[PDB]
Amino acid sequence: KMNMLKENVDYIQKNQNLFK
DSSP: OOSTTHHHHHHHHHHHHOOO
């Protein structure tokens, strides 16, 4: 379980901030 470490912490910030 060593992929959704930085990707999970980027997904929560992607929902609220929306950096597309």
